[PDB]
Amino acid sequence: EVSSILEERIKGVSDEANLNETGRVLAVGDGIARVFGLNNIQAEELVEFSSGVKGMALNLEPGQVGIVLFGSDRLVKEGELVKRTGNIVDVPVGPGLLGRVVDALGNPIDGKGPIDAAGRSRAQVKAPGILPRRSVHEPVQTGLKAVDALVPIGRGQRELIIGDRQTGKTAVALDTILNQKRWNNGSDESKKLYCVYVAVGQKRSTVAQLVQTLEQHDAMKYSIIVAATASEAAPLQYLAPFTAASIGEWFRDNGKHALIVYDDLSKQAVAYRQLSLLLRRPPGREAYPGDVFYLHSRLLERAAKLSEKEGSGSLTALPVIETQGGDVSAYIPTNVISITDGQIFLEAELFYKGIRPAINVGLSVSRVGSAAQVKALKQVAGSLKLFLAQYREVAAFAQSDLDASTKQTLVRGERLTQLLKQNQYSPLATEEQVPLIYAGVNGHLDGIELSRIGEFESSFLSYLKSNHNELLTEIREKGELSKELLASLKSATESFVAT
Template identity: 55%
Template sequence: MNINVNQLSETISKKLNNERSKILEVGTVLTVADGVATVCGLEDVMFSEVVKFSSGALGQVQSIYYDSCSILILEDEIAVTEGDVVSRTHEILKVPVGKHLLGRVVDALGKPLDGDILDVDEKREIEVKAPGVMQRQSVHEPLQTGIKIIDALIPIGRGQRQLIIGDRQTGKTTVALDTILNQASINKSVPENERVYCIYVAIGQKESTIARLKQTLLEHDALQYTIIVSACAGDVAVKQFLAAYTGCTMGEYFRDNGMHGLIVYDDLSKHAIAYREISLLLRRPPGREAFPGDIFYIHSRLLERAAKMSRDRGSGSLTALPIVETQEKDISAYIPTNVISITDGQIFLDSSLFYQNIKPAISIGTSVSRVGSAAQRKAMKQVVGSLKLELAEFRELEAFMQFSSDLDQDTKNAIRKGQLLTTLLTQGASQPVDFVEQVMMFFATQNGFLDHVEVDEVKAIAKKMTIFLEAKHSDLLDRINTLGKIEEADSNQLKEILSGFFNIKQSNEEQKGL
């Protein structure tokens, strides 16, 4: 019998390699504690790879050592016990994406929480590289929030990252929610390719809060344009950490397909705390305020994925509104300074303004948009003028209001104008104002038509003015809205119309007085 030694050796070697690779594909759970499993045997496992336990639970590799690895248990933590077999999947965590998610509430893994079955057409990895500079274009399209003070003074553009920051219970979520409601209102009257689809990521919120938010969206017919990703306070830290990346991946679907997305992270303070908990459980060395050294990278790799894509890539956009909570207005704390340096500006909500019932309680002095008027339509730029300067001057003069009898006339006029503007810019929750109505209000203010109106009555009269214009001169308003600017002829016509409106109103009031 002839035996080919080389062939026999090659066959045995192949079988041994196959057996070895099978051994390297599985491991054994050594310990389980606080949602972290220590596993040995997975010698070729990759960082962030999804693994499967023999109980059916899924885990994600977070730390790799010489003889073991640490795995975060994503679900069914109780079912995982010491001695369980763990197998590789060779995949990074993926979540479902697509329009079929609109109107749904899902968890950090993309699984439905509202009871209905979810049809999965496409899945994407939650960890991807942010678009490079050459894949983007500058932010130039406005994202109308419906909030007068923001659209006029701190404009947000499609593809921008604008931070909402402030103390607890100052209206941060309300600002983000009103922005979502305004997108839904606009979506009903624009072509499908101009619509903005919203993703609200709730991190560490109470389930009752998420239920109320869903109900608000439903009542305003906005849920059909919104995806809610929920990682509530009762969920494990890993789900609270992953929820932000899950929501971002869902938003990227719209961005990469030539559509427009808006994502709200509520909030990144709790997101950072969840990651700190994970890092400490993994025995990584703590740094400033006990946060791990890579916390800046955690947020930067998330927020850098918001972008306005180039024309070659469909001109889609993903706008990010991260929310960060401060303690006693301290914006110099670790997480706030990190996120401020990553974003393109911040909207700072001042608790002292909130307690004065000035809502939204936005501080003009500390709020800024680095995109600025590039994200505004020309009509808005034409009418806001020196509005921000006048408001900032008023906030400086507020301290002297108690000495009103000793002030000169110019200072009194500046204070009165500031009070009038502050009142005009106040706005109730869930009451977004459309673009044309805002432009008409600021046009009347800029041209002095509201100067002699009582401060307490200015909002009501401005509202009556816009109702009058919509009823009698809708063609003029439609032309301004279509052009996005006020032509000189339109400006002169508006002045003539408003002069008549306010003269009639003034004469009626004088007759009542007599």
Template identity: 55%
Template structure:
């Protein structure tokens, strides 16, 4: 039997051959340890170089976000399942800041706070990433708001106009139509080159699904992305959702495009942030909110801007929504957001219940910078509309107690009823700005004074039908140039007045219950809605108003 011999050269050659394909897998990593976990919060020790908002990775792969940096430990919120995290497990600092996907690949999709699709349409494609929280544009990088963002809502575009880059608050009690105003604004952006982000915070999944179905039905998902953090989500997701939506919109703004971000609603975000802060043992302040709750909203809304030409001239408009309790706009969160934004649209419960929809309180609604963005044709058409309606509200209170009015006051009261009826709109039926100009000009110049209140909606519908078929050139000129040919418009309105036949020629300042019908939302030209105070309206079924 031959003897097996292995020389040192053979051993050396074998070792060298194996070492040729060896790549050392070594790196430095900060590793800490979980010392406490519960209620979606983990307290970690042993990460001395960790930064605020840095992402942490737990042993089971779950991501956390470092929010509290104490001397001995770190308070982090867990963005995922907490059940598999236990005391004593290791935690690794990733050195990365929380980021979300952005880009045109998001359009038409429904994603969660972290940008993960939840609509069952597969993974995202054609997207990049950007940090969820970034610094807002500086003063020198901005430009004054001067381009209109048409909402399609007559009461807003005429009296509280919104410009691209503006922050306009929508505020009111629950069930007053706040979300409807925001959704109608998104629907009106079709074909106008504005990409929309709708952020649903703390809503039921069924409500979000209904909103998405409405957007799809009107073709609005072709330019919209929906970010949802439903009521079932942990508080950290609801607190971070608006920043995720803002980052997505800011991507388009910084690329020279126009974006619209709707935050529905920031009251729930503030409540979620309060929960997170209390769990992190931060000292509570007024209404148990932490001391930096103002900064929570200001750093979000300040990221909306109209950029200068040197920065691409893009814009991002913000429509934050705040829910009030019993109409109290002097509460902590409402006053904070009112002071941050460039104006507010105030929706009133009494107006909503009396059939005035959208239920916009003209006296308490204001736009601080949007007037510069309003087109000249609209300014001409509106005239003294806001003043006339304010005078009407005062006269209406006198008339309700049976005071005798002189002829001038009675005429102002009669016109006020007609203007109020004219400003009503149906659900999900935004009106192009050129058509708004026509109907508002007719109302403010007295063409409706001889029309019974019950016929105002029919007058509007038939007038627009005539203009769409016979005066299309006038509408196109208003849309393209923003200017109004008053002579041509008045001639067309006089011609229409000759052919319009009121259902009751007697007119009158107030409709009877038989004329007004039920106080439900209808399309232009449909059956008129009630405009009387609620106690004077006879309804067959009071439960219909709660919808």
């Protein structure tokens, strides 16, 4: 009954003990309460106002402690008691946060009831050192053929998804999450990446879309959506990736694998800017706070592929940066680009030219890259890198009297480009990546008409499944293409091409 739940709630209130340090607001303007009291305050400690607003204490000044209100200014007012919660910013971390859309405080904003968590851990915990890591050696397949082959993604490593505004940047990311369902379904903890999507500054409408798509693809059961929406205030926005990271750290600490996608640090930047400028802390380049480099670096170094002494685990990360007019020159992009280890650069022109994913192969790089590529997939796509490279060079030659060699490049190149188109929100298994690319490599697709490439693709897959799903199962399980398989595969492609 509605009465009973309310009755439980009233019953759950009862008594208190000494409020250790009161404060009285001296002046509150701009969400920067300047409090007299709180003598023994810990740095960035959580403090609770009379209004129930929570705050952090970024400035501990020589007589006032400059609380930053997490809430709206309207609720706080001068002279308010400022109780000292006495616990530095910490968020529940545990296993129960899977399938729970939580805000930064950890309060379910989807009302999926009290969080089940195994610890509350500070959000300022410092990254694992030099020796506490062991070099990347575990792929993470994204189900996007281009990502997996052109810029292979490992574990504990970080690569940007740096690209033009609202090119459905989130879509490129979301695809990765979907592909993790296949590996997730399996029982092996090796095969379990527990993804965390960190929605920073994202409108609630966007988060509704996010929630529904994830639920639709049944993804929630390894997903966590840390949500700091547009409305949510600048302290929350600031601490939102930090909070998220801590959740990831628990998984990482358990030695499991997970992928945390910070989308987008550009809005994180804005929040720090807001905090600093409002706290009158020294401004800096491009009106971004002086220590913005320090902020981004702290976040991005948390991601780590742990050592075997620390029972190898990972916290793969994929930061998303939104470029303003495609300016990699811009201060926030330049910093992040330097910090990260690889970039994937989505390009608007390509999007318009209908290439989706609109990843610009040239401006995509991985500095870990092929080190964590599936062996099978590595074999069948060294050629692919070179062909596309040539296709780029011979691109401008597409205006008559064209050398046979250039024309050969063009046919092969155009067909490949068409092949790498994919319908977003459908990920493709590695066991089906490997055949398609093999065909392209063997240039049997060169013959197939450009218009028919799309039809060819699905047909080839169905044909392979009918013709020999034994081969496919072998590809999946062996993971290394034997000469007999490469032989059979060539034959299969030839046979398929014949029909």
